Structure 1
Amino acid sequence: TEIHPSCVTRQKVIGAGEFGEVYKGMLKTKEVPVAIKTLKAGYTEKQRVDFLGEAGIMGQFSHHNIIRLEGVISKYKPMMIITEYMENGALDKFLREKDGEFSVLQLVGMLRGIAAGMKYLANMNYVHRDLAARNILVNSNLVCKVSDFGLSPIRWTAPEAISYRKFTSASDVWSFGIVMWEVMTYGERPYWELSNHEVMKAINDGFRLPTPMDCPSAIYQLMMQCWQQERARRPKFADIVSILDKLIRAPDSLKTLADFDPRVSIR
């Protein structure tokens, strides 16, 4: 959809872009709130291709858990990508600002949503490469929409994508496992203070993130299987969506928690 510049008003700056700013604003069709990514004058050929390519793929995406493209401005400068505005913003910040305020069923439902959007992207043969809670937006219905703000990560990346740039939907499944851990922990930093290199050496040496507090056994088992070293052994996003859907629809299944590895405090 081509949007006319007269239908768009920018208000706030809310981020930075490839060669532009990200704004909040209002779109006419009263006025829907929207987010606006601009491509400022002097952008390169390559930048133009990535910008309008991004706009095109977003326009072909149509799924509940994928950021919805309101429209594009391509015939006027600056060029713009206009999406629905997501009131609660990015999931990582959102969960960190709302620590403990959600039920396990709400959290697992946020994970089903993300995994559904990811299954859709993998099925459309789109490799995300930067799946993290910082790239997931949350609307006022707690509905998670996969997005990409393109500031690209090691900690969320599969070992083969690190080691030799093999980015696939199986590498996105690894990232999704990290996202599961981010969610169930209310936005804790994966591996905490380990450096990037220490994170790579811990993974390749077989360490995996431990269980979040208050995490259903089935949810930890699932993220653990997203972190298989052998990429062919990881669940497909269809497997993930399926398991999450069955857990949610039979919610007692989430009452069995995985053990939490503590630290001492004694009577």
Structure 2
Amino acid sequence: LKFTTEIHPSCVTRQKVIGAGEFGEVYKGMLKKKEVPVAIKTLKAGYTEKQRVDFLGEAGIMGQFSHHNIIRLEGVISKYKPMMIITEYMENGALDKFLREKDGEFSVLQLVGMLRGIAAGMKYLANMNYVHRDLAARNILVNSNLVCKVSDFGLSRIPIRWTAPEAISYRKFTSASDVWSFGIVMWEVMTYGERPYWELSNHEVMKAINDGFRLPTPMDCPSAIYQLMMQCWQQERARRPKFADIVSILDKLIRAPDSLKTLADFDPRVSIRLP
């Protein structure tokens, strides 16, 4: 915690609720240059020792990171109550909701650029020896430059449809199970926030994966992008790409953007036959 800035409560004004529930809220606010917008997570009085450890532990983890694609910590209020964690404010909110509300509005190159940013954040985390365990579009935040930043840190936090088989089966969470999750995130981005495996139950998903089924190609998806998410979903952990590999491949696709024009075939679930 010694790494984090202690912010005085008088510098913080909460303006609008934007999330959370039982033991605190998340607000958009202003931090007092001139005042800058921030997000503010609170911890209400009555919190337990474990709640305090997990709450300040998230701040402690975030304060150790300094990367473009990782949510930045402004500081904490720990001396006064309620306690607060103050971060940069991401104007466009969670990536999954953002894509669903903006269906079809971005170029393929913009979507792939979002994935590159997420992958760069994840490469940083993995090399820093941090395993996320809950990588999903709902835990990616988007700013007004369309920059995607990984969020939701700690060990306070399984989400079956995003989780690698070894993590479901015997609780082995590694950066390689995060790669599996990243593949699902690729699919979420390229589908504009479709629900993975649609209406299959959790048990049906686990069974489908164990029998070798994988999510089908999104519409209008570059062949290179589908091949890459498929390799993220290798049953054998050692065969998946590392995040270094993913960043490299996405970089090269974006720098030669004509590579993205070759689309993988889409399997239509409906046929319209007209004379």
Shared fold, TM over 0.5? yes
Deviation at 1:18, TM superposition (A): 7.0
Contact 2:75 2:85 in 1 (8 A): yes
Contact 1:17 1:38 in 2 (8 A): no
Q: Deviations over 1:137-184 (max 9, x none)?
A: 000000000011889711011111111111110010000000000000
Contact 2:217 2:267 in 1 (8 A): yes
Moved more, 180-189 or 49-58: 49-58
Q: Deviations over 1:111-134 (max 9, x none)?
A: 000000000011111111100000
Q: Distance in 2 between matches of 1:125 and 1:157?
A: 19
Q: Distance in 2 between matches of 1:187 and 1:242?
A: 24
Q: Distance in 1 between matches of 2:34 and 2:253?
A: 40
Residue 247 of structure 2 is aligned to residue 233 of structure 1: no
Contact 1:18 1:150 in 2 (8 A): no
TM-score (norm 2): 0.94
Deviating beyond 2 angstroms after TM superposition, the runs of 4 or more aligned structure 1 residues are 149-152, 263-267
The verdict on how the C-alpha distance between 1:18 and 1:71 changes in structure 2, with shifts beyond 3 A counting, is: farther
For the residue of structure 1 that corresponds to 2:59, the secondary structure is helix
Deviation at 1:266, TM superposition (A): 3.3
The verdict on how the C-alpha distance between 1:150 and 1:100 changes in structure 2, with shifts beyond 3 A counting, is: farther
Moved more, 90-99 or 30-39: 30-39
Contact 1:17 1:37 in 2 (8 A): no
The verdict on how the C-alpha distance between 1:17 and 1:129 changes in structure 2, with shifts beyond 3 A counting, is: farther
The alignment yields a C-alpha RMSD, in angstroms, of 1.5
Contact 2:94 2:142 in 1 (8 A): yes
Moved more, 43-52 or 118-127: 43-52
Residue 110 of structure 2 is aligned to residue 134 of structure 1: no
The verdict on how the C-alpha distance between 1:240 and 1:264 changes in structure 2, with shifts beyond 3 A counting, is: same
Deviation at 1:265, TM superposition (A): 2.6
Deviation at 1:45, TM superposition (A): 1.2
Q: Distance in 1 between matches of 2:154 and 2:66?
A: 20
Contact 1:91 1:134 in 2 (8 A): yes
Residue 205 of structure 2 is aligned to residue 199 of structure 1: yes
Q: Distance in 1 between matches of 2:262 and 2:155?
A: 38
Q: Distance in 2 between matches of 1:125 and 1:151?
A: 14
Deviation at 1:30, TM superposition (A): 2.2
Moved more, 143-152 or 221-230: 143-152
Which of the residues 10, 26, 31 maps onto 1:27?
31
Q: Distance in 1 between matches of 2:113 and 2:140?
A: 14
Contact 1:15 1:23 in 2 (8 A): yes
Structure 1 residue ranges without an equivalent (≥5): none
Deviation at 1:29, TM superposition (A): 5.5
For the residue of structure 1 that corresponds to 2:93, the secondary structure is coil
Contact 1:13 1:21 in 2 (8 A): yes
Q: Distance in 2 between matches of 1:18 and 1:235?
A: 39
Structure 2 residue ranges without an equivalent (≥5): none
